[PDB]
Design a protein around this ligand. Structure first.
Ligand SMILES: Nc1ncnc2c1ncn2[C@@H]1O[C@H](COP(=O)(O)O)[C@@H](O)[C@H]1O
Ligand SMILES: Nc1ncnc2c1ncn2[C@@H]1O[C@H](COP(=O)(O)O)[C@@H](O)[C@H]1O
Ligand SMILES: Nc1ncnc2c1ncn2[C@@H]1O[C@H](COP(=O)(O)O)[C@@H](O)[C@H]1O
Ligand SMILES: Nc1ncnc2c1ncn2[C@@H]1O[C@H](COP(=O)(O)O)[C@@H](O)[C@H]1O
Ligand SMILES: O=P(O)(O)OC[C@H]1O[C@@H](O)[C@H](O)[C@@H](O)[C@@H]1O
Ligand SMILES: O=P(O)(O)OC[C@H]1O[C@@H](O)[C@H](O)[C@@H](O)[C@@H]1O
Ligand SMILES: [Cl-]
Ligand SMILES: [Mg+2]
Lengths: 417, 423, 423, 417
């Protein structure tokens, strides 16, 4: 019987198990034998077939029949990337040939899909066929606008639930939370949690007009929101900050971010955007009775059990992977577009400037973004021109209307309106 | 003085109603509008008494609506009171809306509610009142672009998946079959959504039956063949999801059997009382007579009222926020007799007449498309006897033996089911 | 080689079973023991065929059990196969346990399961096998010190509260009364727990009735008085929780009305089939006849099977970890024919004789103590007509008016209920 | 009619609304008038009766009928502490007499109850035990309300981190909020089957050393590594920080002088215990294939909706508060023992040495703690004496058995065994 081998690469996203079971269950009805490599390419990279066999498992009906309820990956995952060396690619080729893998399904990001493509291009097209299923919780794939990636709905819904608790706590015991949403690729996740939870502010890198962000501008964008709320009698709130703001910050901004010290180097993961902003905002606003606390939302989302939307989603993706193999496809991506799962060649989706799959960011000109912005607390262009409002907000911050305008009015050219 | 926006809810609740109320109210308040909410839909506007209406309307203020986007239900309640059946009632609603000086009238409800709103408007000056309705249904039966859901549907489906998950674990731990009846007779979207998400072993919806009228025996035999096939692979347990809409497709003879070989009940005016039907219970009794001797136990379970007012999931919190906004946007843009709907990520008003089915005069009902790719995928992961399966003699012998019957007896009893449902 | 510990589950599942399996297994593995698990309780041990038993036993290894403390249900399944009724079966179980060289035998189940384990033990030498059972019940009906719960009860109560919350929001949003029937006829702990936690407007348990047999009319009237009193305060909706055990206290005449003025159903052996009763539905139909004219709609809802295999809450995860440990500790200390129970924060073995009720031969049933302060507190926050209320002429006039009847009629009809239930 | 005034003090806990609703509903059936002071003692401490009047609300039936489902507190809370000054204490009395409060119910932790009694020595005063830290001196085995909810949600969050730690091999250092005691950290850890839990109660000496904490985590990671597992979750009580010596705090803050408030007291809130330990352990263990990430669990627990156990608990506590008022009790705490709610005089609960409410910590000699410890991964005394085991672990850490013994064996005198 033909052998289908499955592995996962990259970080988990809710629904991985749904893709594994969707492919495996359908393949088993066709009489296929299904195996799963543990920890992605980690052990295939050694080329030692005994080591690979000690870290592969038989994906059977009993194993996969009920994993569609569970977050995580039953075959685990890794960022092992055989593409960096030609010897590693040939090790993976040597182990896949040894196992008689006819169909090769990888579930991972592009680094994972590219590894699959590298191993295949140096391999006869009649012995092995290779398909990758693109996974990302960041929702940054180039699908038709408003169409989500699998695992995103789960990550957003649980994030909404955590922020709900922080909104209740911020009101019950007046304080501001700066919630840093993990993920530096795009602003989909931070804005999704913020809009759903009715957070009072959301900052994403996509809304900044100039190419590089300055630390002072981020502090003042949050500062103006806190003062405006205070002008309406509210000394509390929640502001959600996409971690991707950090990767748009200038070199000088990163120097201030790390405590006016030299930034580490091989290192954006050591940055604490929400914490740094909290320290700065407390000096400026503490005298007004404001307390500010950072909170990170990230790792607890990756392996939450999938919500129904992602359970249906990943079942249809697993099916479509087997369907593509049957139709002779290879070097393709299983994606869902306009309700149809279909294979799409890797090159059809690449951005020529990057060599990586094209990244879809938040469209800050769309109506969805402007609607989210309407329900935020912030000072618009029109608001700065309203002298009754500007006087009340300035007074809340114990500064003159001229001082307030002098400091904050420029922010309308910092971010889209 | 400031224009008055009045809001009411009609029909049955769905998760996200409060989100539409908060989106409309908060945006309207930033425009300086005054916002009021009628309690229990058209119930008191139908009386024409302005004192009764005022005793059952409330001022929708910032503090009231600021944090209801987290909460299920309706803070202004709802009702099925329907003024469209009478011109005196329509004129009563007009008399009370004029009295309260409602400039913008937003109804959040089903088809009966939207039709009532337009009827009340056609006898009104287009410069004094403007009317917009927001379409609500957990049944997902609105004529929207395919695969795009109505608000509250995602919440109802996700909670339904979680409940069935408990029943799937319970069915395996203590071998048994559950016949889960999903509430809703309009369409099969909800039953099929929960089943596919939960990996249930079977789903039956009215849309998959070819003939115009379903027979009780056919439904019994579709479940029976599934139980036997699982039993042929050593599994004496499972979950089967049944859309309540199977009942409303059943023939006269099938309904007589459904109600216990009794005359089907009827209301004063002559409508058969399908709410009193107990589909899952009736089928369980029959399947237990046939299969209990094989070691099969079957139990019915209904999933319905606990879904309607669950707190909205994030998808519906965003959805209903954009709808509440879009209603205010439609008022500002001079629209009236329109329905706020979302299409390809864009909220826009769509005229009520544009959505009607010309043959019926009512809004067209979107059912499950059983020819689509999504339905064929759902069907692959179910346990069932397909056309090809009935031709596989090795399989038919294994299943027949599980049911303690000859292979010819099995083929004679169940094989006709391939002409009952689309394959 | 290493001592063999065999584990099986009997009876209906309860949240935390897996926690007991993992607590016992992990500790035993640190001791160097070999751990096996029989699938579906005594079902295959009853056959006596050792090949069949081996085909339905599994090696409980570290990797199998390391992360099952999060999961509801039981990974080794369960069954009600009861070898206690036959020694031919008991000796089959003995034959398979000797063949597998089970030194330590742990059963997690109800009274039938614990009794079966001891019967298999009384016919073996005390040196070759030691037997411990962990008593399981989601009904909280074990004779532990008062206010101390059985494992799985906290989870079932908390999930039941969550379901009723959705019904409380739905009952207010779309005015209606829900009759929530909590499944389980043993006791009233579960129904009262969900009701008190959720602030339900009424709860009826068999324990609060003074007389030995309940009458159908009295149950109807106790709910009816609550609906009328709420109606007198402008609320035409609510939730009432009914313990299913009301059915098992009903008189012969009461059961005749319950089943539709028919003879109660019966099994082949003549015993009555109370599972076919629909307590909430029958009361709903009757209450609709009496109160529908007042604007009341009433709907039944069952809460039962979705509770059994919910994932355990933290209280039950810690609880079942301590029980699994205490079973291994009891084996190590030479105990046998004992029950692992937790009392006053201490897990300890308790000999079978300490817990049996001599009248039954089965474990004693702990019911709700309706004289306790906890019950009086729960009763304070319900909507109901007390002794004092019937003597308050101002109140009786408003409630009577809500029911469109004279105060003389109301007192004459309902006043006797103060001798029906404890006050 | 008599006036019952209700306030909340301290940090929020799930079930606050349940006590407000139980007390208010029962009091209203008695014909009482019920008012709620906003933000605890914040405004009563000013002595300005005009300000207090602007921050009190009438607790009515429609307000409280359905808040037993809701986390947080509708009358908010604060840590305003009239106990620190006699001038403040008389301010609270002046405002309460002005409002003619006959019955005064405070709902709060140990800090709150001590404030309540100070106001009383000169109206009837009752306090209800609140704290997710479970650190009130209640009868043994009886929890404070809100503890069950905080622990159950904490278990659920850690479950997601456990699935993520195995799926994408890594160690999470979960910092559980609360420096008072170890109840919360040990509860979440035991329920979630976490691989290690460190609480201040298990340390023998009066002062913890930073190196000892690092090494307690290090030995657990190496032992797991000796059994083929390069991942896990370790739960750390924040109270480890408040036991650390002056030198341990210097290393904790980055070999900095610890921050301090204007009075000379150290600012432990600025400490990042889990983050600091992660940095140190990554330097030592990164080469072995170990990744370590810190995660804090705290503020998202405080205002979760109450679980059924806390809903019933706080319903009975609110009732018992009114019943104590009816029976003439004062300066008492409503507590539950053996299913009976009863008032317990405040003097019975004082620490003769401290004058403040006694703080109940984890009893590390109890059977519950010994069982929890059995299911952890750690090196006991007997384990350090097992030469076969010591060789296996030492090899996992790429060190000789002599090096391992010299570094780690002393830890048996650092923590109870
Ligand atoms: N930036 C903002 N975002 C959302 N709502 C706001 C904002 N500013 C004011 N509001 C609300 O808009 C309404 C109108 O404010 P005003 O024009 O000051 O009466 C009030 O209910 C405010 O709370
Ligand atoms: N109707 C069905 N739906 C889903 N899986 C099935 C169905 N029928 C058989 N299988 C599974 O498909 C695989 C192939 O079985 P076989 O037909 O014996 O080769 C086995 O794992 C079966 O349990
Ligand atoms: N049976 C009951 N259970 C709980 N609350 C009640 C009940 N009857 C009346 N109440 C409430 O108790 C308060 C006092 O009512 P009254 O005695 O009419 O002034 C009001 O808030 C009523 O709604
Ligand atoms: N510190 C520990 N805590 C819990 N389990 C352990 C610990 N150390 C070893 N184990 C497990 O206990 C069993 C006994 O291991 P061994 O003594 O090496 O045979 C194996 O399943 C180990 O994985
Ligand atoms: O055989 P089991 O253990 O009952 O598993 C049921 C499985 O049966 C199939 O219908 C589905 O494809 C699976 O998703 C489902 O879980
Ligand atoms: O060894 P794993 O796969 O990491 O499992 C983690 C286990 O580690 C142990 O500490 C516990 O006994 C288990 O309850 C826990 O789940
Ligand atoms: Cl075996
Ligand atoms: Mg404290």
């Amino acid at each position: 019987a033909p052998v289908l081998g499955i592995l996962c690469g990259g970080g988990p996203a809710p629904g991985l198990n749904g893709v594994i079971a969707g492919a495996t269950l359908y393949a088993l009805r066709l009489g296929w034998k299904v195996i799963g490599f543990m920890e992605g390419f980690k052990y295939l990279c050694t080329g030692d077939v005994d080591v690979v066999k000690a870290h592969t498992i038989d994906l059977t009906y009993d194993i996969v029949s009920r994993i569609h309820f569970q977050g995580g990956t039953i075959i685990q995952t890794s960022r092992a990337n055989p593409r960096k060396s030609p010897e590693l690619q040939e090790n993976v080729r040597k182990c896949l040939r040894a196992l008689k893998v006819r169909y090769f399904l990888t579930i991972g990001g592009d680094d994972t899909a590219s590894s699959a493509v590298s191993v295949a291009s140096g391999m006869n097209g009649n012995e092995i066929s290779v398909i990758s299923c693109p996974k990302t919780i960041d929702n940054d794939l180039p699908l038709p606008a408003d169409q989500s990636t699998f695992g995103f709905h789960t990550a957003r819904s649980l994030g909404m639930e955590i922020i709900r608790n922080l909104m209740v706590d911020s009101k019950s015991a007046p304080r501001w939370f700066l919630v840093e949403a993990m993920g530096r690729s795009a602003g989909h996740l931070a804005l999704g949690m913020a809009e759903a939870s009715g957070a009072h502010l959301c900052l994403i890198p996509e809304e900044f007009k100039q190419d590089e962000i300055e630390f002072e501008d981020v502090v003042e964008l949050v500062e103006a929101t806190i003062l405006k709320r205070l002008a309406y009698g509210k000394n509390y709130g929640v502001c959600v900050l996409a971690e991707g703001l950090v990767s748009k910050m200038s070199k000088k901004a990163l120097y201030k971010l790390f405590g006016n010290r030299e930034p580490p180097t091989d290192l954006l993961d050591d940055a604490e955007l929400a914490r740094s902003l909290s320290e700065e905002l407390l000096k400026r606003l503490g005298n007004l009775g404001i307390r500010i606390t950072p909170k990170k939302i990230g790792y607890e989302l990756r392996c939450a059990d999938p919500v129904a939307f992602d359970a249906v989603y990943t079942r249809e993706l697993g099916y479509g992977a087997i369907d593509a193999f049957l139709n002779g496809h290879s070097a393709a991506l299983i994606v869902r577009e306009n309700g149809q799962v279909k294979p799409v060649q890797f090159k059809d989706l690449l951005d020529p400037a990057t060599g990586r799959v094209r990244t879809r960011l938040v469209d800050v000109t769309s109506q969805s973004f402007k609607v989210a912005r309407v329900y935020m607390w912030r000072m618009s262009k029109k608001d700065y021109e309203n002298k009754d409002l500007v006087a009340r907000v300035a007074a809340a911050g114990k500064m003159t209307p001229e001082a307030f305008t002098e400091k904050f009015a420029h922010l309308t050219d910092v971010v889209v309106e």
